[PDB]
Amino acid sequence: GLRDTRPGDTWLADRSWNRPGWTVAELEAAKAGRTISVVLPALDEEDTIGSVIDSISPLVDGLVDELIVLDSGSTDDTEIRAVAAGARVVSREQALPEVPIRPGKGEALWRSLAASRGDIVVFVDSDLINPHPMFVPWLVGPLLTGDGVHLVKSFYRRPGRVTELVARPLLAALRPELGCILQPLGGEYAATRELLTSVPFAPGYGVEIGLLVDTFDRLGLDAIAQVNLGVREHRNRPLAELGAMSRQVIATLLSRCGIPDSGVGLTQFVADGPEGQSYTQHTWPVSLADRPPMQAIRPR
Amino acid sequence: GLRDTRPGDTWLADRSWNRPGWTVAELEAAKAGRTISVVLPALDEEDTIGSVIDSISPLVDGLVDELIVLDSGSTDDTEIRAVAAGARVVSREQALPEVPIRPGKGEALWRSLAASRGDIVVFVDSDLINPHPMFVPWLVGPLLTGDGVHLVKSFYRRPGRVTELVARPLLAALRPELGCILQPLGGEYAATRELLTSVPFAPGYGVEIGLLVDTFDRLGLDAIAQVNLGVREHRNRPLAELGAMSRQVIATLLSRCGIPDSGVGLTQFVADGPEGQSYTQHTWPVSLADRPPMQAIRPR
């Protein structure tokens, strides 16, 4: 199983595997009137976003019915570079004009449900360094070979900390059935519109884990598959922000589990000098506020 | 406050500071019939333990009434080297013969309550690299200048991960009042026997955080002070063990907070090779079992 795994192989909930024997073209034939949207959430990713689109670009009007960059307030060259690469850029405002904006990644992904049309939505981070062109095919595979699967999570070999020390040990504690999930926080995943629009979306860095847990609670482990995406490269996560990310992952998971979170942000104490003679007190925001199921706002 | 802090300064619960103006000799005079025990928990620390004792050694028969190494099953030269340095070595069995041994650090510290006699117990890790001779004086300071303080936690400048990403964000979520604690997991701390023998001891890597939270719940923030211990050096924590440590910190905190922990260990998936073609599944143990207050076993 995980003793013999390829870029392409799917792990199902019953610990059974599948090594895909289709072509991109055969996957398109399997769609059967189901449409596919690809969504790239982007905040200030001018360096990487053209490359990411180029990887997915060839699939459009074939396997992929639409390719959207959800621009989350970029002040760099993200939009013009995504357009020149061939993607349609939708701002948060454009996606859902009648609801005021909240900050964070979860907001952007939630809004993209309103901006996209696809029966299946694939999410891919725009900060990926050289994503393999087979990423979207590999992600959608298990949805199209339809066996009750509604969420496809990815796993990869690193070519970190918050996943290994925070997300996974907390899942072992609070949702032990999800202990099989290698990469609960990863931004490459696919799901049905039916699933996506029926669940609330966690704010900020909580979005992926909130979706995982909501899917498990409502549909059980069988609705969740994982695909080996191989060696996956992304940008260095600046170490300064990781405390805030952990705090938000914690807030989201506690809230899914029915445990009251104080709503009190992490205060970090940063030594100002080598002697530890003074500290800068830095308090990051945490959000306990989900967005409601998209069905409650923009129903289909 | 933390805008101007020395090796020696104490932070109290009301955000007020104290910069000590005593000598080791004046601290001894302040004891007033209170005895002081120093306890060094040790599992296989032959390289560092002589040095640690040498730092504390000069205080014995003066400020320090006894110095005990609690040997937690060492198969290297820890015991002979601690003896030659001048400490008394007590095995777990010797400390408390009538209770069977459980593994982990918390067990060793709990047992040391039975092995030691001091009204005040100071705990110092035996893996410290060149601890400053003032560590024990600085730790006991706030207990002897008696103003209702029962627990003294330390903080230091690093000359990590589990503290910053796991312990502190979870405390912000579940015990926000303890958000002021810089180093909740640190092994250098002092407390009263009255406090120590009245609380249960968490197992393994949960011991320090369990003690912090128990103290807070039972006595409030005022009973807790923190002392700047300056630049503090210890051994590199092998990165492999950190998941298990986080999982146990999580288990202990959830249990203190009244939240059911599954008792299911973290399963880590270690890539066997560069390709991510197979993973080794490695499941670390977690313990939900405290030891009871020492008063229930070996009352004074």
Does the beta-carbon distance from A172 to B228 stay under 8 Å? Answer: no
Q: Are A101 and A72 in contact (CB under 8 A)?
A: no
Q: Are B193 and B296 in contact (CB under 8 A)?
A: no
How far is residue A273's CA from residue B268's CA, in Å, rounded to a whole number? 36
How far is residue B63's CA from residue B82's CA, in Å, rounded to a whole number? 20
Residue in chain B nearest A246 by alpha carbon: B165
Could you give the strand order of the β-sheet that contains A120-123, starting from the edge strand earlier in sequence? A17-18, A10-11, A224-231, A151-157, A189-192, A120-123, A36-42, A66-71, A88-91
**Taken in order A49, A53, A54, A55, is the CA torsion positive or negative?**
positive
Does the beta-carbon distance from A5 to B276 stay under 8 Å? Answer: yes
For chain A, the straight-line distance linking the first and the last C-alpha, in angstroms and rounded, comes to 39
Class of domain A1-300: alpha beta
- H-helix or E-strand containing B149? none
Helix boundaries (H) for A86-206: 92-95, 105-115, 135-144, 161, 168-174, 193-196
Q: Are B57 and B26 in contact (CB under 8 A)?
A: no
Q: Are A104 and A110 in contact (CB under 8 A)?
A: no
Q: Are B234 and B159 in contact (CB under 8 A)?
A: no
Question: Hey, is A47 helix, strand or coil?
Answer: coil
Has A79 been labeled as part of a binding site? no
Q: Are B40 and B68 in contact (CB under 8 A)?
A: yes
Count of positions (residues) in chain B: 300
Question: Hey, is A266 helix, strand or coil?
Answer: coil
Contacts of A11 in chain B (CB under 8 A): none
Candidates A165, A173, A279; nearest CB to B262: A173
For chain A, what are the domain ranges? 1-300
Interface-testing mutation among A4, A17, A161, A272, with chain B (most B C-beta atoms within 10 A): A161
Q: Are A261 and A287 in contact (CB under 8 A)?
A: no
Question: Hey, is B84 helix, strand or coil?
Answer: helix
State the nearest Cα–Cα gap between B253 and chain A, in angstroms.
11
The secondary structure of residue A43, as a DSSP letter, is S
Q: What is the 3-state secondary structure of B171-240?
A: HHHHCHHHHHCCCCCCCCEEEEHHHHCCCCECCHHHHHHHHHHHHHHHHCHHHEEEEEEEECCECCCCHH
Annotated resolution, angstroms: 2.0
Amino acid at B209: I
CB pairs under 8 A between A and B: 140
How far is residue A201's CA from residue B187's CA, in Å, rounded to a whole number? 40
Tokens standing for residue A134: 């087979």
- H-helix or E-strand containing A263? none
Contacts of B265 in chain A (CB under 8 A): 172
- H-helix or E-strand containing B69? strand B66-71
What burial class does residue A32 get, using C-beta atoms within 10 Å of its C-beta: 0-12 exposed, 13-18 middle, 19+ buried?
Answer: exposed
Q: Are B196 and B294 in contact (CB under 8 A)?
A: yes
Does the beta-carbon distance from B243 to A271 stay under 8 Å? Answer: no
Count of positions (residues) in chain A: 300
What burial class does residue B204 get, using C-beta atoms within 10 Å of its C-beta: 0-12 exposed, 13-18 middle, 19+ buried?
Answer: buried
Q: Are A256 and A218 in contact (CB under 8 A)?
A: no
How far is residue A258's CA from residue B232's CA, in Å, rounded to a whole number? 39
Amino acid at A20: P
Beta-sheet pairing, A88-91 with A66-71: parallel
Contacts with B32 (C-beta within 8 Å, 6 or more apart), sequence order: none
Residue B300 CB neighbour total at 10 angstroms = 10
Contacts of B261 in chain A (CB under 8 A): 173-174
Q: How many CA atoms lie within 13 A of B202 on its CB side?
A: 24
How far is residue B36's CA from residue B44's CA, in Å, rounded to a whole number? 25
Does the beta-carbon distance from A274 to B157 stay under 8 Å? Answer: yes
State the nearest Cα–Cα gap between A193 and chain B, in angstroms.
31
Does the beta-carbon distance from A243 to B276 stay under 8 Å? Answer: no
Look up tokens 């998941």; give the residue. B243
**Taken in order A56, A237, B280, B203, is the CA torsion positive or negative?**
negative
Tokens standing for residue A44: 């200030």
Residue in chain A nearest B161 by alpha carbon: A161
Residue B286's alpha-carbon distances to A165, A169, A172, A227, B248, in angstroms, are: 14, 10, 10, 29, 6
Tokens standing for residue B82: 């601690």
For residue B170, give the nearest of B254, B266, B288 by alpha carbon: B254
Amino acid at A124: V
Q: What is the signed CA dihedral for A13, A15, A16, A22, rounded to 10 degrees?
A: 60
Has A105 been labeled as part of a binding site? yes
The number of angstroms, rounded, from the C-alpha of B75 to the middle of its chain's C-alpha atoms is 22
Q: Are B71 and B89 in contact (CB under 8 A)?
A: yes
How far is residue A131's CA from residue B37's CA, in Å, rounded to a whole number? 59
Contacts with B25 (C-beta within 8 Å, 6 or more apart), sequence order: B62
Does the beta-carbon distance from B5 to A277 stay under 8 Å? Answer: yes
Residue A9's alpha-carbon distances to A31, A137, A226, B57, in angstroms, are: 19, 12, 9, 61
Tokens standing for residue A198: 């029926």
Question: Hey, is A198 helix, strand or coil?
Answer: coil
Residue in chain B nearest A8 by alpha carbon: B277
Interface-testing mutation among B154, B246, B272, B282, with chain A (most A C-beta atoms within 10 A): B246
Amino acid at B178: L
Has B206 been labeled as part of a binding site? yes
Contacts with B256 (C-beta within 8 Å, 6 or more apart), sequence order: B202, B209, B210, B213, B214, B217
Residue A71 CB neighbour total at 10 angstroms = 25
Has A44 been labeled as part of a binding site? yes
Tokens standing for residue A298: 């923009």
Q: Are B125 and B205 in contact (CB under 8 A)?
A: no
Tokens standing for residue B220: 């409030």
Does the beta-carbon distance from B264 to A169 stay under 8 Å? Answer: no
What burial class does residue A258 get, using C-beta atoms within 10 Å of its C-beta: 0-12 exposed, 13-18 middle, 19+ buried?
Answer: exposed
Residue in chain A nearest B273 by alpha carbon: A157
Residue A77's alpha-carbon distances to A23, A38, A187, in angstroms, are: 35, 21, 22
Contacts of B228 in chain A (CB under 8 A): 276
Contacts of B161 in chain A (CB under 8 A): 161, 165
